[PDB]
RNA sequence: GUGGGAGAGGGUGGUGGAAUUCCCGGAGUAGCGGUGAAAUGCGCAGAUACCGGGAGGAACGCCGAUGGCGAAGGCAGCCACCUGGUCCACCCGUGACGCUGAGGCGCGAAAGCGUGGGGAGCAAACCGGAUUAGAUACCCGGGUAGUCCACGCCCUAAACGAUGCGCGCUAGGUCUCUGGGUCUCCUGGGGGCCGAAGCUAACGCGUUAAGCGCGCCGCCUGGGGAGUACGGCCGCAAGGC
């Protein structure tokens, strides 16, 4: 097992039993991938950057975790097949370079 | 006879030509215009003077359909690429914004001999 | 002309999901600023530059965007 | 990889005495340990060249620590040889 | 051995935006294109320019360097995984275990060959338009192989620092990438410029030696004939040694 973030990307107008039900699906997901879950950030709306899906905006999760590195990729491919999921990033965690430190 | 209110002013400029298109607020045009189609023919449809005319008639012809506000997107380089949104603004068109959109590649395709 | 990092706090030249410092190196077009601009070092760059790129991805940064007067 | 836990549990099993890190025997079982992870890696991806000469390398620098061995101990090197399968 | 690091080093899967092309759709006329000027060419079956959607392949802008990595050929989006090399510090372990290296074996840009895919853009051959005394050429428009992927061959090159590897020795100054330090500076390890002594036919080189030395491999012996002939080996061929 190591660090990962995850990032998670879906569709900014889903309502309360869409968007929790989303978010279950996310989480047997990392429980069927062996994913442990060290904690958890959400942002939700954000204004995009570009639109992606069409969509002026997203919704934003982001997990950090430790888990099995045979696994991490299928895990992600697991998390994408959502159709409304539009991007799942995940990155092994570093530690915070500061500058202007 | 759309009736048209302000809109949105394209010149895309190149190193033969010069064109200029014009449109609603949406992106669906009213007129436009070449160097070409006033008359002039080969070399000549890339003078500055080309550009000129060329802004102008699709003013003229925009002003037609009642064409007031302009806001202005410039593609391509070329003589008059500035020409063009220099008598784009003697118009009488009052200008609403300049904007320069013209398109780059991040690297992907090969050029053409002429080109590297 | 002031440097970037010359104003800017304690900051982490890491995190990919913080926007609002992280805009503040490119120009009006989405274009990361060179050393020349951003007054960092090689390796500050070259770690800003990644971390940039993964923003970009998440679509919390911009690839490009348009120059306005002209 | 090689994480430090089993590295250290073979230089445990290799040493001569506690704490020697550097006997030609920890270092020829070391070595070995390296060189069949590198063989289980270009058994798939064969198409990787690099780390291939990475391995001629290492196998290389085996060979010269047994030649020594067995020029020195030939008991030593009898055994060693014959706990770590080669040959 | 332990701890710390930088990296377009490699292999594998995913994935992102810009752009070109193409298809669909709205809106909108009479041209667009391209040149030194032109013409072929495309356009009323509605092009070009503008907007919205889709499909496909290829390559990664800025960051980017006078930068980094690699033995070399070479290596740039982002992510994960598999893996190679290497630098520093600590002074801990082994105790000369070393250097070079004819054969051998492996790698080896591009183009090229075979089998099977793929095909946006570019594009030998080719088809045209021009230019010219003529044009098989430069310039224009098209365009097949190829370019891309899997696998298997081919083994060349200005494969260049035109500079074989390893070690010790011989003033500095300066810019830099990356470690460690009591961090005007110092101390390793790369990358550049100037320059002591010295070398050099000169040009230049000069702690990244082309100086002072040692070890070992490769190679040379006027120009053409000629990298030809013959012979041998390798190669499906082209052709290579
Ligand atoms: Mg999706
Ligand atoms: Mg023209
Ligand atoms: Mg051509
Ligand atoms: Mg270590
Ligand atoms: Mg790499
Ligand atoms: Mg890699
Ligand atoms: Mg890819
Ligand atoms: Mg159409
Ligand atoms: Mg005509
Ligand atoms: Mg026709
Ligand atoms: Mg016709
Ligand atoms: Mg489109
Ligand atoms: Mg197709
Ligand atoms: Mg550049
Ligand atoms: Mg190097
Ligand atoms: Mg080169
Ligand atoms: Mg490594
Ligand atoms: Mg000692
Ligand atoms: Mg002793
Ligand atoms: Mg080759
Ligand atoms: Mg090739
Ligand atoms: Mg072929
Ligand atoms: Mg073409
Ligand atoms: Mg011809
Ligand atoms: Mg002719
Ligand atoms: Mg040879
Ligand atoms: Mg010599
Ligand atoms: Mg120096
Ligand atoms: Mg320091
Ligand atoms: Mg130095
Ligand atoms: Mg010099
Ligand atoms: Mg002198
Ligand atoms: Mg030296
Ligand atoms: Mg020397
Ligand atoms: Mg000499
Ligand atoms: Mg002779
Ligand atoms: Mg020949
Ligand atoms: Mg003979
Ligand atoms: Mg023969
Ligand atoms: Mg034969
Ligand atoms: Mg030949």
Redesign the pocket.
Known sequence: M?R?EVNIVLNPNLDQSQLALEKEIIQRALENYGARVEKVEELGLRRLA???A?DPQGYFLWYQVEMP??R??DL??EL?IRDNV???????SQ?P?LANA | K?QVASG?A?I?A????T???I??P???????S????IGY??????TPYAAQLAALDAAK?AMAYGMQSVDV?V?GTGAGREQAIRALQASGLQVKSIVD?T????????????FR | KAKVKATLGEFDLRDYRNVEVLKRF??E????????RTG????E??????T???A??L?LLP??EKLVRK | ??T?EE??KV?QEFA??P??????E??VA?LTL?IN??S??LK????????????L??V??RR??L??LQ??DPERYRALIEKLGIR
């Not at chain 2, 190149?14 to 030509?17: E, I, K, L, V």
């Not at chain 2, 949406?26 to 436009?32: C, K, L, Q, R, V």
Request: contains cysteine; charged residues 35%; positive net charge.
């Open positions: 190591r990962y570009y639109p992606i069409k590195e045979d991490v990729n992600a491919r994408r539009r991007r799942v990033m995940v990155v092994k530690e370079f | 759309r949105r394209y895309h190149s190193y033969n030509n064109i200029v298109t449109t609603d949406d992106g669906n045009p009213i007129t436009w070449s160097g070409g189609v023919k080969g070399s000549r449809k890339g012809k997107i593609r959109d398109p780059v590649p991040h690297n992907g395709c090969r050029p053409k001999k002429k | 490119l120009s077009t989405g274009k990361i600023l060179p050393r020349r960092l070092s090689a390796k760059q070259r770690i800003l530059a990644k940039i790129k993964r970009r991805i679509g690839f490009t | 990889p090689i430090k590295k250290q230089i001569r005495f704490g020697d890190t550097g006997s030609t920890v270092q070391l390296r992870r590198l289980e890696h798939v991806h064969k198409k990787d060249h690099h780390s291939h000469r990475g391995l390398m290492m290389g620098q010269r620590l030649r020594y020029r020195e």
